[PDB]
Each structure stands twice: as C-alpha cells, then as structure tokens.
Amino acid sequence: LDPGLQPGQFSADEAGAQLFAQSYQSSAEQVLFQSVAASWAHDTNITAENARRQEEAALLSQEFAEAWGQKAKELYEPIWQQFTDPQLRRIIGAVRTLGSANLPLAKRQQYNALLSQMSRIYSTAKVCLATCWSLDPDLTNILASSRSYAMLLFAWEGWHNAAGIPLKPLYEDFTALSNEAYKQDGFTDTGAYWRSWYNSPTFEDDLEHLYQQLEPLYLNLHAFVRRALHRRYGDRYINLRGPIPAHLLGDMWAQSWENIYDMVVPFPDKPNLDVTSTMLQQGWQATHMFRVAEEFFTSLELSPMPPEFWEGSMLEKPADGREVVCHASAWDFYNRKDFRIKQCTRVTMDQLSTVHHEMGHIQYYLQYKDLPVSLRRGANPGFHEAIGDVLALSVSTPEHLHKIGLLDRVTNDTESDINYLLKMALEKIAFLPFGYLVDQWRWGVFSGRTPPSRYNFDWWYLRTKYQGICPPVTRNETHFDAGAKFHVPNVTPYIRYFVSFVLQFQFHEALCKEAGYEGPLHQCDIYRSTKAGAKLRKVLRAGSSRPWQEVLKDMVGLDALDAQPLLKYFQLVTQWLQEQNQQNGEVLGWPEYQWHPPLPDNYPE
Ligand SMILES: *[C@@H]1O[C@H](CO[C@@H]2O[C@@H](C)[C@@H](O)[C@@H](O)[C@@H]2O)[C@@H](O[C@@H]2O[C@H](CO)[C@@H](O[C@@H]3O[C@H](CO[C@H]4O[C@H](CO)[C@@H](O)[C@H](O)[C@@H]4O)[C@@H](O)[C@H](O)[C@@H]3O)[C@H](O)[C@H]2NC(C)=O)[C@H](O)[C@H]1NC(C)=O
Ligand SMILES: CS(=O)(=O)N[C@@H](CCCCN)C(=O)NC[C@H](CC1(C(=O)N[C@@H](Cc2ccc(O)cc2)C(=O)O)CCCC1)C(=O)O
Ligand SMILES: *[C@@H]1O[C@H](CO[C@@H]2O[C@@H](C)[C@@H](O)[C@@H](O)[C@@H]2O)[C@@H](O[C@@H]2O[C@H](CO)[C@@H](O)[C@H](O)[C@H]2NC(C)=O)[C@H](O)[C@H]1NC(C)=O
Numbered sequence: 001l002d003p004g005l006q007p008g009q010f011s012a013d014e015a016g017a018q019l020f021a022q023s024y025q026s027s028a029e030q031v032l033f034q035s036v037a038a039s040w041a042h043d044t045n046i047t048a049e050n051a052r053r054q055e056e057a058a059l060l061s062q063e064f065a066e067a068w069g070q071k072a073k074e075l076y077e078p079i080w081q082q083f084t085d086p087q088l089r090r091i092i093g094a095v096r097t098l099g100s101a102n103l104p105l106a107k108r109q110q111y112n113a114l115l116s117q118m119s120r121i122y123s124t125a126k127v128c129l130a131t132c133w134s135l136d137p138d139l140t141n142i143l144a145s146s147r148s149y150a151m152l153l154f155a156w157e158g159w160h161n162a163a164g165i166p167l168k169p170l171y172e173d174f175t176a177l178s179n180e181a182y183k184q185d186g187f188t189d190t191g192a193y194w195r196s197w198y199n200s201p202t203f204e205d206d207l208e209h210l211y212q213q214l215e216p217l218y219l220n221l222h223a224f225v226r227r228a229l230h231r232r233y234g235d236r237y238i239n240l241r242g243p244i245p246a247h248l249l250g251d252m253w254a255q256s257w258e259n260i261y262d263m264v265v266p267f268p269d270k271p272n273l274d275v276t277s278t279m280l281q282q283g284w285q286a287t288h289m290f291r292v293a294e295e296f297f298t299s300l301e302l303s304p305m306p307p308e309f310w311e312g313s314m315l316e317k318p319a320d321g322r323e324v325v326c327h328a329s330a331w332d333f334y335n336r337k338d339f340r341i342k343q344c345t346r347v348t349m350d351q352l353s354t355v356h357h358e359m360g361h362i363q364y365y366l367q368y369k370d371l372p373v374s375l376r377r378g379a380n381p382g383f384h385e386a387i388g389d390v391l392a393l394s395v396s397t398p399e400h401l402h403k404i405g406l407l408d409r410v411t412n413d414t415e416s417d418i419n420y421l422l423k424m425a426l427e428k429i430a431f432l433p434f435g436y437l438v439d440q441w442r443w444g445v446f447s448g449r450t451p452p453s454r455y456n457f458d459w460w461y462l463r464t465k466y467q468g469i470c471p472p473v474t475r476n477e478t479h480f481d482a483g484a485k486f487h488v489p490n491v492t493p494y495i496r497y498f499v500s501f502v503l504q505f506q507f508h509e510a511l512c513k514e515a516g517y518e519g520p521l522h523q524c525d526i527y528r529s530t531k532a533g534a535k536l537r538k539v540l541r542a543g544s545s546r547p548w549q550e551v552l553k554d555m556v557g558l559d560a561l562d563a564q565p566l567l568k569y570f571q572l573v574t575q576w577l578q579e580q581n582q583q584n585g586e587v588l589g590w591p592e593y594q595w596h597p598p599l600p601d602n603y604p605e
C-alpha cells in the first residue's frame with residue numbers, strides 16, 4: 001500500500017476517533033476512485049487484460065480496508081460503541097468491519113477471481129441455434145415480442161441453461177468465502193450484513209407485513225393475466241387453476257409484465273398507452289431519450305448532467321466488435337467530477353423508464369458529491385433506487401406523454417384510467433413478489449438453510465410460492481436458474497428494489513402534494529414543479545448522513561415504509577380487477593401447484 005494511504009497515529013478516545021475518521025475519508029476517496037475506474041474500464045470492454053487490472057484494483061482496496069480497519073480496532077474496538085456522536089459511531093463501526101479484507105491474501109485473490117469469472121459468464125453467455133443470440137438485445141426482444149410458445153421456450157431454456165449451469169460451482173465457492181469474511185466482522189453470515197444497512201431490528205417482519213397487504217393485488221392481477229394468456233395460448237399451455245409458465249409474461253424473469261400489455265388491455269379503443277411505436281415512427285434514438293430525461297430533472301431545478309457525463313457515458317451497445325456488460329448501470333467515480341451511465345439503450349417506452357431510473361442514480365451522486373465519501377450513499381439503498389422511478393411515474397402519465405409529443409389523443413374517462421392503472425400494475429405490481437423473493441432465496445443460501453444440493457429446488461419453491469409461475473421445461477439441481485439473473489453472479493443485493501417499489505409511491509404522494517396538485521394521485525405530473533424539486537433535493541443532498549427513518553419523516557411525514565400510498569394509487573384498478581375476476585369465476589391463486597405445461601410437439605424445433 002502506498003505510504004500516502006496508510007493510517008498514522010491517533011489518540012485512543014473519542015476526540016482522536018474524530019481525527020481518525022477525518023483522515024480515513026481523505027484517503028478513502030483516492031482508493032474509491034481507482035476501484036471505480038478499474039471496474040468501468042472492464043465492463044465497457046471485456047478483455048482478459050482489463051479483468052486482471054480490475055482484480056489488482058480490488059486487491060488494493062482490501063489492503064486499505066485492512067490497514068485502517070486494524071487501526072480502528074487497535075484504538076477504538078472496546079469504546080466506539082459508547083461514543084456520544086452517532087455519526088461517528090456509524091463511521092467507526094463501518095471501518096472496523098473489514099469484509100473480504102479479513103480474508104488472507106490467497107483467499108482474497110480467489111474471491112476477486114470468482115467475482116470476475118462470475119461476471120464474465122453472465123455477460124458473455126449466448127444461445128446458439130453457427131450463429132448465436134445475446135441476452136441484450138436478441139433474447140430480450142424475443143421474450144418481449146414473440147408470441148410463439150416454442151420460440152419463447154427456446155430462448156428461456158437456452159438462456160437459463162447457458163448462464164446458470166456453469167455458474168453453480170463458482171457461486172458455491174463465492175458464498176463460502178463471503179461468509180468466511182463477514183463472520184470475522186461479527187455477522188452470522190453475509191445476508192445479515194446486507195440486512196444491517198437498513199438499521200431496523202424488525203426488518204424481515206416489517207417486509208413480510210408489507211407483502212401481506214400487497215399480495216391480494218398481485219393475486220388478482222395474476223388471475224386476470226392468466227385468463228388473457230389462456231385465450232391466446234389455449235388450455236394445453238395455460239392452466240386456469242395452476243401456475244403460469246415462466247416464459248410467457250414478456251420478460252426473461254417474468255418480473256415485469258409491461259410487454260404483454262397488448263394482450264391484457266381492457267379497453268383497446270382508448271388511446272394506446274404503449275408509445276414505443278410512436279418513438280420508432282418519430283425516430284427517437286438513445287441520445288434523445290437521455291436528453292428528455294435530463295430536461296425533466298432540470299424542470300425541477302435539479303442539476304443537468306455535466307459535460308464529463310456526456311463525454312464519458314456509453315449510451316448504446318458498441319457495434320465495433322467489443323464485448324461489454326449490457327446490463328444498465330450508473331457510476332460514481334468518487335472524484336466529484338466523473339459520473340457516467342453505461343446502457344445498451346433500445347428505443348422503447350420501458351427503456352425510457354430505465355433511462356430515468358439510471359439518471360436518478362446520477363442525480364443523487366451529483367447532489368451529495370461534496371459530503372465525506374462515506375456519506376455518499378442513499379439514506380438506505382432503496383432510496384437510491386426510488387429517485388428515478390418517481391420521476392418516471394410522472395413521465396408515464398398520458399397527460400405528460402401528450403406534452404412531449406408521444407400521445408396525440410387526450411382522454412379523461414374511467415376506461416382510460418383503468419387502462420393506465422392496469423399498464424402500471426403490469427410494471428409495478430407484477431414485480432413485487434419477485435422483488436421480495438430474490439433475497440429470501442439468497443439469505444437462505446448465505447445462512448446455510450439452502451445448501452448447494454437445494455439451490456434450484458428452493459429457487460423454484462419461492463418462484464411458485466410468490467409469483468405463481470412454473471418452469472416450462474423440467475429442471476433439476478444441475479440447473480442453477482437463480483444464476484441466470486444478473487444480480488446473483490454480480491453479487492448485487494435485491495431487497496432494495498422491493499423497498500423502492502413501495503417507497504416510490506410514498507415519494508410520489510409527498511411530491512405531488514408539495515407541488516400543489518389536487519387531482520387523483522395516478523394523474524399527478526410533477527413536471528416543472530420547483531417546489532417538488534426542492535423537497536426532493538433535500539433528500540438527495542443528505543446522502544447517508546442521517547438515519548433513513550428521519551429523512552423519510554422530513555419528506556413524507558412518516559418514519560416507516562408504508563403500503564398505503566401504493567394502494568391509493570392503484571385503488572380503482574384493484575377494485576376493477578377484483579370485480580372482473582369474480583364475474584369471470586376465476587380461481588385466485590394456483591392450487592394445482594404441481595402443474596407444468598407439456599413440451600411442444602416438435603420441440604426443440
Ligand atoms: C380527470 O377528471 C377528474 C374528475 O373530474 C371530476 O369528476 C368528473 C366526473 C366531472 O364531474 C369533472 O367535472 C370533475 O372535475 C379530475 O379530478 C378532479 O380534479 C379536481 C382538480 O382539478 C379536484 O377538485 C379539487 O378537489 C380538492 C380536494 O377536494 C376533494 O376531496 C374531498 C375529500 O376531502 C372529496 O370528497 C371531494 O370530491 C372534493 O372534490 C379541492 O380542495 C380543490 O379545491 C378542488 O375542488 C377533484 O377533487 C378531482 N376529482 C377526483 C375524483 O379526484 C382530474 O383532475 C381529471 N384529470 C385530468 C388529467 O384532467
Ligand atoms: C453498483 S453500480 O456502481 O454499478 N451502480 C448501481 C446503482 C448504485 C446505487 C447505490 N446503491 C447500478 O447501476 N445498478 C444497476 C441496476 C440496473 C437496473 C436493475 O438491475 N434493476 C432491477 C430491478 C428494477 C428496478 C427498477 C425498475 O424500474 C425495474 C426493475 C432489475 O432489472 O432486475 C436495470 C435497469 C433498471 C436498474 C440499477 O440501476 O439499479
Ligand atoms: C438433469 O437435467 C440434465 C439436462 O437434461 C435435460 O433436462 C432434464 C431436466 C430432462 O428434461 C432431460 O430430458 C433434458 O435433456 C440431464 O443431463 C442430460 O441428460 C440427457 C438425458 O436425458 C443427456 O442426453 C444429455 O447429454 C445430458 N446433458 C444435457 C446438457 O442435456 C441430467 O442427467 C439430469 N439429471 C441430473 C442428475 O443432472
């Protein structure tokens with residue numbers, strides 16, 4: 001470790017810990033920068049050489065964490081928990097938590113190589129027929145636009161086999177090393193460390209209680225959509241009392257159902273609220289999508305994207321041969337200057353939402369860039385996920401789409417409302433069970449309740465339990481279907497997204513009220529509300545300097561996650577779907593839990 005970066009001397013009392021914390025953060029900024037820079041260099045240009053440089057950058061961060069962490073334990077381990085300044089307790093408590101830097105050097109190298117190899121498997125997997133399809137755009141477009149059961153099945157099976165199977169041995173090894181590292185910091189397993197970010201002793205119970213409120217909305221949406229699919233695919237491929245085959249819902253993971261809106265829209269004679277075809281007819285490209293998203297942010301008197309963002313970002317998939325990680329991402333280089341998005345942008349309405357999601361991450365980075373590096377985080381990780389989704393809620397309204405030229409026809413009637421709320425339910429309510437289950441699966445793997453011998457059995461137990469889907473071909477434990485979802489091999493926690501899909505409606509309600517809007521919540525558009533912008537800016541500028549419960553109280557008037565704003569938003573369609581399902585004599589749920597569809601006659605082709 002370079003001499004500039006090593007801890008010096010500090011007094012073993014609270015006053016010395018303040019000076020230690022100040023000096024830690026000054027050096028950490030430079031270690032953060034070299035780490036982000038090396039991760040960026042590779043994911044936009046996947047080469048063996050860039051992988052090696054990234055592993056070397058990771059090893060430097062471990063050296064730094066060990067040096068300062070051992071210094072913190074030497075001076076403050078028996079006393080920091082009683083320090084009077086709560087912000088200091090948070091920083092010292094983090095520095096004493098060494099993470100993978102607890103691992104001896106050989107195991108650090110093994111850990112870092114596993115993360116590199118797991119990333120590469122996921123982001124270079126292909127499905128082959130001589131010629132081969134990538135996840136993004138090829139398989140993504142098949143799942144979204146094909147209505148051929150056998151083609152959808154070829155893409156779904158091809159992807160899950162190609163990405164999952166080779167990951168399993170690596171994921172087993174990663175899990176053990178990760179647990180070994182965090183156990184030395186005092187956590188029972190890695191999942192307990194991840195959950196600690198929310199600083200709530202009742203986190204898991206609080207989440208389960210939220211899901212109990214939301215589940216009836218999902219069950220009714222599920223039953224209605226299953227009926228719509230039955231009308232298209234027939235009684236052989238859809239069981240009206242069983243789980244939906246997992247490849248028919250528009251998305252590789254059945255996690256958003258937006259793409260099947262045309263099969264479920266209740267009143268197709270009203271305006272077509274999927275504006276993709278109009279974006280295509282009008283010639284939108286990726287740069288238009290990012291500039292329109294930026295202009296929403298500046299309409300609120302939030303910050304434009306700086307030149308470094310436009311000069312450095314990757315906004316389309318390279319067509320010059322390179323392999324890149326196409327999964328969208330937003331980067332803080334921790335130098336207060338460089339902030340970038342990497343997105344393999346496609347010209348679609350749901351991608352326009354994704355652009356806003358990613359720019360929300362950038363806006364957060366811009367607003368807290370001058371805090372100490374350890375406070376340059378969301379008030380909790382769910383806050384970071386909600387920012388862009390909140391703006392996108394306004395952007396998707398038919399009223400806003402009209403303003404930006406994407407929906408000529410204007411209507412304000414009950415049918416048009418049901419159409420819009422149904423479309424939003426396909427995006428937001430359908431996600432909730434998936435958002436919830438992914439880290440239930442991973443928490444059980446980290447705790448050892450789900451050993452390798454049950455990775456897929458327990459995955460599909462949860463997928464059926466919560467989402468009411470089933471795999472369309474037979475799976476066994478050589479399959480590793482969790483590993484075919486980006487966040488598993490890339491070791492990105494997922495419960496942040498369940499939190500953010502609830503939180504974003506709490507934010508929407510608060511901002512709409514601040515903007516002076518007095519209509520139905522689902523028709524609010526906060527565009528050009530500088531008062532809403534100022535209220536949002538306060539959250540963004542706080543970073544993680546204050547407990548999330550108190551930041552939330554200042555913003556929305558309550559100190560807890562609450563499902564009521566989401567329920568208020570959807571109330572009209574919640575009532576409508578319940579009435580429709582009763583009228584159609586639906587079974588809510590999937591009591592034929594064993595059912596799986598047959599194979600097509602000529603399968604594989
Ligand atoms: C789409 O249309 C709706 C409905 O419009 C009303 O209903 C239809 C059937 C016709 O009668 C229209 O002429 C009506 O306007 C619009 O929602 C209404 O928006 C207006 C604001 O533009 C709202 O009026 C405000 O309401 C404030 C709150 O008071 C209400 O709340 C009490 C409970 O405390 C409730 O019981 C009562 O109904 C009150 O009206 C009030 O402070 C303020 O001064 C103003 O009166 C009205 O409440 C809205 N109705 C509903 C049902 O939400 C949408 O704005 C319109 N959308 C678009 C995009 O144009
Ligand atoms: C680690 S980092 O430096 O690279 N920066 C992170 C953000 C740091 C936040 C600070 N803690 C990052 O960029 N992460 C990538 C991830 C990508 C997306 C992702 O996976 N979304 C989940 C769930 C989801 C969320 C919103 C939505 O509307 C629909 C689905 C998914 O698609 O399954 C794919 C497109 C939308 C986001 C992200 O932005 O959150
Ligand atoms: C687990 O499954 C693999 C994959 O076989 C496919 O999936 C099964 C669930 C089943 O539906 C099979 O009909 C599918 O072909 C099995 O490995 C394959 O076994 C077949 C024999 O059926 C053989 O021809 C292939 O070479 C094997 N490999 C592949 C990639 O297909 C495996 O035997 C199953 N059992 C175990 C314990 O892994």
Ligand SMILES: *[C@@H]1O[C@H](CO)[C@@H](O)[C@H](O)[C@H]1NC(C)=O
Nearest residue numbers: 044045046047048049050322
């Ligand atoms: C990709 O990485 C290699 C080194 O691995 C480098 O020589 C090359 O310039 C990079 N390409 C781009 C477009 O940055």
Ligand SMILES: [Cl-]
Nearest residue numbers: 377378381384
């Ligand atoms: Cl965060």
Ligand SMILES: [Cl-]
Nearest residue numbers: 381493495496
């Ligand atoms: Cl999280």
Ligand SMILES: [Mg+2]
Nearest residue numbers: 144259348350
């Ligand atoms: Mg789409």
Ligand SMILES: [Mg+2]
Nearest residue numbers: 256258259350
């Ligand atoms: Mg989608």
Ligand SMILES: [Zn+2]
Nearest residue numbers: 357361384385
């Ligand atoms: Zn995000």
